[PDB]
């Protein structure tokens, strides 16, 4: 049999607003059918001790869908994440860990990188290091048959992501973000890259993963940045999408470029590579 395509939800900064988020997920599932997974890519916890979280931790309330969450983006929230390699925080809510590869039984491959960039030694529990980026690349890109991954989840935006694409509004993408996330994205080539933390919604035009007439053609990447839950400006914080995993796709169909595709934003000009 040819398998039915998966259906997924991606969520931005939750910020401790668990009741608002999960009621919305319940309403959508009642209306449009069941989704397989919810990926929460921003601040899951708020700054102040959250009475709401205690009801979920104890099992009085239960998440309506299997939820994977990215980690403690700051010092205030590190206490909620007990095991750095990942652990179940509450029923149907699982912390993926600092870094690793998740491969679902459908074949969906998700690579995740939690935290903000840091060069300090010892590495803080709320930060990622150059070692984290290098380790992920070696696990996947060293195999001669590597084409890319299905989904990359990071909390900060990649640095210089606004190059060649449409306007990112109020976020200056050259000054904000993490250069390591940009380098990681270039090597891993995700079909979807979800991010948050900048508290705004931005769906960038797709960019190609190959260099025209220098390398053989590769698939395009769609980068989507999500807003914070319950924001007053009503920016889009929950994104629903349906994906066939790369392993099941025909090679000719996978590499097809949309008409509005742009250049890869992270590629330096020919004068700067001389260093």
């Amino acid at each position: 049999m040819a398998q039915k395509p998966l259906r997924l939800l991606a969520c931005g900064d939750v910020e401790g607003k668990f009741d608002i988020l999960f009621n919305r997920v319940q309403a959508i599932q009642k209306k449009s059918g069941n989704f397989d997974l919810l990926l929460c890519v921003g601040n899951f916890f708020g700054s102040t001790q959250d009475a709401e979280w205690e009801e979920y931790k104890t099992g009085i309330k239960k998440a309506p869908i299997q939820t994977y969450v990215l980690g403690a983006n700051n010092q205030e929230t590190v206490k909620y994440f007990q095991d750095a390699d990942g652990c179940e925080l509450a029923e149907n809510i699982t912390y993926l860990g600092r870094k690793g590869i998740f491969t679902g039984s459908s074949g969906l491959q998700i690579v995740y990188l939690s935290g903000t960039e840091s060069l300090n030694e010892p590495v803080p529990g709320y930060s990622f290091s150059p070692k984290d980026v290098s380790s992920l690349r070696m696990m996947l890109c060293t195999t001669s048959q590597f084409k890319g991954v299905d989904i990359l989840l990071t909390s900060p935006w990649p640095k210089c992501v606004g190059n060649f694409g449409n306007s990112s509004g109020e976020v200056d993408t050259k000054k904000c973000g993490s250069a390591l996330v940009s380098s990681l994205a270039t090597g891993l080539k995700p079909r979807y890259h979800f991010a948050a933390l900048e508290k705004t919604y931005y769906e960038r035009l797709p960019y190609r993963n190959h260099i025209i007439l220098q390398e053989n053609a590769q698939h395009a990447t769609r980068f989507i940045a999500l807003a914070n839950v319950g924001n007053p400006e009503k920016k889009k914080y929950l994104y629903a999408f349906s994906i066939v995993p790369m392993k099941l796709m025909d090679a000719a169909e996978l590499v097809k470029q949309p008409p509005d595709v742009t250049e890869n934003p992270y590629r330096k000009s020919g004068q700067e590579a001389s260093i």
Partner: protein, 650 residues
């Protein structure tokens, strides 16, 4: 059923959303401009609706003229639109082109060359055969089209029933609108899919190397299915490129997908030109994309739509006709294109699906160095053939006639000077009977005069053969790999007095060998040029017969046989003569240009005086198709030109 499948396709063209708006303008207005990108449906749909208009008008059915600058374009679109009207070609839809007329008394839509409607205008000055005349692809601003714009601006003041439609693919409509008395504009929007525009980071030093490399790289690395369009400047450069692209892909081994290379240039036969409408090759079993690459001159720049094109390669060059009136030289030179041309080139990509245009020059250079519009051909051509046609049209005031982009007055002075000294004009400048006959020949005036005046030297059979061999591509096929065999075959026909008599020998031997295709191969003779020359000769003779011009031959055993031909040549080309100066270079009469015999001549030595058919401006000045003449003939056959009072000392 084939008509219905054509109908399903043609109804999707952008123009059909404007058919009612087109008809509303056409009935109410006498002149108007129609702008639409190439592939919008202009050449195919607009004249058919004019046939619908012309069929509903009462009275005698006048035809629809639609001009096409290019013979290849005119023939192929006439065939196509006959298929769109479900009629036979040469019945209700026909074509008429220089040296080939496929029309009849049923023809109500004729696609034609500019230089045939203008020639019909010389015989029907109000163009009464037509009720609608369509000036299509007028943004090329060809030499005969620019004249036709002014002729129709005269006729519209005299014929309120004639409708004139100027069709363009460029945004330069303001020139066309204002010139036809502030006529309306119908702008047909594009339905071209997006074309990505790529530039190189630095300027390429070898644009031919860059063209070959970019063609191969697209074929290997682009995942979209799609045909390639490589633009080049002309036949000889395409033929070497086609050989190079063949070698450089054959060395890449079996894994590369099949490429279908197809040349498209004006000297190809119709059956080979029609091959461009064939589908691309299929994708190979290994997944490698099958692609077509058309390596074309500017004949593919306008009027034509190659379905399946996704990738355009633009070197930015073409061959344009140039005339230098201060030295009376005509030449073909390779020149840069305009931004308008480069946008039209790029817009070929977006025709069947989204696509890409690879421009081999920097994006900075595109903004500040490329010209906005292509120069009108009248600004860069010898007006001698046009002034001869203009005077035959009753256009006496050649100075204040409304040219859309007027030629330099000096260039007009050269056209009058050429015709005055030929006795096609008198000293007052009026068109003589000799000129009026010369204009009817689809020839250059030098060639037209030479055919007519050769009757009095009893050698008009031979000169008509020479003119026909000159009115067609050069007849010696000289392959780079086969030069030795081609020259040794050519020397069997080489006449000592030069190339005109060598062309005569080739043509006579061709007719004596019963048009044999095999004999042409075995002697490296261009069978297609010769059949074209035979076609040219049989129609020019029908023009000669129309003017009762006697087809005469001199006795072949007479010493004066070749001598009389050489005298007859002087009657048209006495201005294109050079004298052998004491230091062994040649000096052209009056303009004093230092020239050399062209390396394709049969003349191994230098006569004291040579007549030449063509001046060839390159890295050196050459004169091509040269013949020995005696100086005592010059002062006797052309005393007005060879008056020693005004003639320079040479």
């Amino acid at each position: 059923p084939r008509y219905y499948d054509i109908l399903k396709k043609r109804l999707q063209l952008p123009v059909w959303e404007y058919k009612d708006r087109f008809t509303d303008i056409l009935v109410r207005h006498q002149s108007f401009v129609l702008v639409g990108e190439t592939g919008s449906g202009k050449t195919t749909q607009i004249p058919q609706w004019c046939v619908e208009y012309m069929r509903s008008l009462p009275g005698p059915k006048r035809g629809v003229a639609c001009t096409q600058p290019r013979r290849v374009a005119a023939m192929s679109v006439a065939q196509r639109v006959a298929d769109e009207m479900d009629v036979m070609l040469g019945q209700e839809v026909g074509y008429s082109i220089r040296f080939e007329d496929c029309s009849s008394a049923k023809t109500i839509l004729k696609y034609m060359t500019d230089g045939m409607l203008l020639r019909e205008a010389m015989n029907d000055p109000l163009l009464e055969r037509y009720g609608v005349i369509i000036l299509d692809e007028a943004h090329e601003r060809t030499l005969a089209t620019d004249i036709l714009m002014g002729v129709l601006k005269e006729v519209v003041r005299q014929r309120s029933d004639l409708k004139v439609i100027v069709m363009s693919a460029t945004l330069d409509a303001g020139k066309f609108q204002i010139y036809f008395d502030n006529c309306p504009l119908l702008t047909i929007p594009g339905r071209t899919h997006p074309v990505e525009i790529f530039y190189t980071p630095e300027p390429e030093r070898d644009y031919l190397e860059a063209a070959i490399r970019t063609v191969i790289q697209i074929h290997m690395c682009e995942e979209e299915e799609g045909d390639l369009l490589l633009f080049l400047t002309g036949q000889e450069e395409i033929d070497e490129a086609c050989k190079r692209i063949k070698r450089e892909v054959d060395d890449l081994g079996p894994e590369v997908g099949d490429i279908k290379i197809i040349p498209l240039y004006s000297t190809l036969p119709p059956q080979q030109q029609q091959r461009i409408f064939e589908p691309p090759p299929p994708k190979k079993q290994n997944g490698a994309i099958g692609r077509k690459v058309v390596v074309s001159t500017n004949i593919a720049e306008t009027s034509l739509t190659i379905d399946g094109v996704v990738f355009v390669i633009d070197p930015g060059f073409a061959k344009q006709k140039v005339y230098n009136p201060r030295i009376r030289v005509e030449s073909l030179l390779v020149t840069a294109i305009s931004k308008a041309s480069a946008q039209q080139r790029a817009g070929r990509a977006g025709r069947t699906r989204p696509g890409k245009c690879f421009r081999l020059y920097t994006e900075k250079a595109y903004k500040t160095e490329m010209q906005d519009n292509t120069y009108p051909e009248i600004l860069r051509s010898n007006l001698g053939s046009v002034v001869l046609q203009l005077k035959k049209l009753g256009i006496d005031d050649l100075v204040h006639f409304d040219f859309m982009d007027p030629p330099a007055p000096e260039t007009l002075m050269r056209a009058l000077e050429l015709l005055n000294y030929l006795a096609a004009l008198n000293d007052d400048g009026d068109l003589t009977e000799l000129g009026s006959m010369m204009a009817e020949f689809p020839l250059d005036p030098q060639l037209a005069k030479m055919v007519i005046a050769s009757c009095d030297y009893n050698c008009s059979n031979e000169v008509l053969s020479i003119t026909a061999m000159l009115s067609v591509p050069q007849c010696f096929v000289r392959p780079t790999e086969a030069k030795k065999a081609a020259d040794e075959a050519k020397m069997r026909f080489a006449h000592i007095d030069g190339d005109h008599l060598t062309l005569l020998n080739v043509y006579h031997a061709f007719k004596q060998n019963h048009e044999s295709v095999q004999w042409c191969y075995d002697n490296f003779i261009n069978y297609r040029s010769l059949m074209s020359a035979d076609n040219v000769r049989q129609q020019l003779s029908r023009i000669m017969d129309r003017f009762n011009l006697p087809r005469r031959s001199t006795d072949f055993t007479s010493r004066d046989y070749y001598i009389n031909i050489r005298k007859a040549l002087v009657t048209g080309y006495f201005m294109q003569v050079a004298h052998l100066e004491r230091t062994g270079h040649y000096l052209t009469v009056k303009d004093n240009q230092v020239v050399q015999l062209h390396p394709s001549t049969v003349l191994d030595h230098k006569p004291e005086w040579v007549l030449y058919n063509e001046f060839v401006l390159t890295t050196k000045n050459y004169i091509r198709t040269c013949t020995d003449i005696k100086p005592e003939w010059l002062v006797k056959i052309a005393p007005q030109y060879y008056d020693m009072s005004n003639f320079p000392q040479c």
